[PDB]
Every structure is written in structure tokens, then in C-alpha cells.
């Protein structure tokens, strides 16, 4: 339930570098693929459930 956008899937760690103001992000198909940690600002990588 990061930042209100509740979803399901495997949370991993990516090598992406978000901007200091962008929190979440989509892909070509406009689907949430990576979000920031709420209390840590860590660049997480949400992947679809297997």
C-alpha cells in the first residue's frame, strides 16, 4: 500500500535513479513498475506476481 496505490506483486530492488520529486512511475503500457519507499525514499521495483 505504498503512497495509496494498493497493488500486488513481488517487491525487488532496481538500479533506477528517480528524480528528487518523482515518487512513483509507469512503463510503456502505463503500469506501475517502480515506486519510492515512503519512509526511506529507496528505489523499489514492483514486478507482477508470478
Amino acid at each position: 500500500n505504498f503512497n495509496g496505490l494498493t497493488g500486488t506483486g513481488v517487491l525487488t530492488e532496481s538500479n533506477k535513479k528517480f528524480l528528487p520529486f518523482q515518487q512513483f512511475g509507469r512503463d510503456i503500457a502505463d503500469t506501475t513498475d517502480a515506486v519510492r519507499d515512503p519512509q526511506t525514499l529507496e528505489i523499489l521495483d514492483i514486478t507482477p506476481c508470478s
Binding site: 528524480l19 520529486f21 518523482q22 515518487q23 512513483f24 512511475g25 509507469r26
Partner: peptide, 16 residues
């Protein structure tokens, strides 16, 4: 007076 804005004024969209 007036001036021409070639390519400016483009702000960032929602935080995506």
C-alpha cells in the same frame, strides 16, 4: 514590448 519564446515553459507533469 514583446518577445518570442522558441522552446521554453515546459514544466514536469505529474510525478511519474
Amino acid at each position: 514590448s514583446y518577445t518570442n519564446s522558441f522552446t521554453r515553459g515546459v514544466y514536469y507533469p505529474d510525478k511519474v
